Amino acid sequence: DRPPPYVAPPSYE
Amino acid sequence: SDPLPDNWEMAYTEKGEVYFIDHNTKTTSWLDPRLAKKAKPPEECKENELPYGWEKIDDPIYGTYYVDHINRRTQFENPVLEAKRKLQ
């Protein structure tokens, strides 16, 4: 079991 | 001290969340580079303090967990408590 995964910011455009 | 470092921008998600754009390395991060603080070993932090870069999240559905924005990790255990525990 694991917490919510890391939520990254929008990818570099 | 308003300006971002040279070749940085800041922008917003559709949810209105700010993030930072580093054109030097072609990366993005939730961390404001203007707000960076000295690193500290987690065990050297006080009980109710988190090291720089960490965020405590209280999720209504998934409960409390900790987010490390430097290394992009998430974990259940408080990292300061964890470090003290493992070194104790």
Numbering used by the authors:
A (entry chain C): 222 to 234
B (entry chain A): 300 to 387
Verbatim from the authors:
We further found that MAGI2 and MAGI3 WW tandems bind to Dendrin PY23 with extremely high affinities (Kd values of ~2.3 and~3.6 nM), further supporting the conclusion that MAGI2, MAGI3 and KIBRA WW tandems share a high similarity in target bindings. We solved the crystal structure of MAGI2 WW tandem in complex with Dendrin PY23 at the 1.65 Å resolution. Notably, the extensive interactions between the inter-domain linker and the C-terminal helix stabilize the supramodular structure of the MAGI2 WW tandem, and the Dendrin PY23 binds to the MAGI2 WW tandem following almost the exactly same detailed interactions as those observed in the KIBRA WW12/Dendrin PY23 complex. In the WW tandem structures of KIBRA and MAGI2, a hydrophobic residue from WW1 (I35 in KIBRA and L330 in MAGI2) inserts into a hydrophobic pocket formed by WW2 domain and the inter-domain linker. Indeed, the I35D substitution weakened KIBRA’s binding to PTPN14 PY12 by ~50 fold, and the L330D mutation decreased MAGI2’s binding to Dendrin PY23 by ~57 fold. The extensive interactions between the inter-domain linker and the C-terminal helix couples the two WW domain into a structural supramodule in these WW tandems, thus providing a structural and thermodynamic basis for highly synergistic bindings to target proteins.
The type I WW domains bind to a consensus ‘PPxY’ motif (where P is proline, x is any amino acid and Y is tyrosine, also known as PY-motif) with very modest affinities (with Kd in the range of a few to a few tens of µM). To achieve this goal, we determined the high resolustion structures of 7 representative WW tandem/target complexes, and measured the binding constants of >100 WW domain tandems or isolated WW domains binding to known or previously unknown targets. In this study, we discovered that WW tandems, but not individual WW domains, can bind to target proteins with extremely high affinity and with very high sequence specificity.
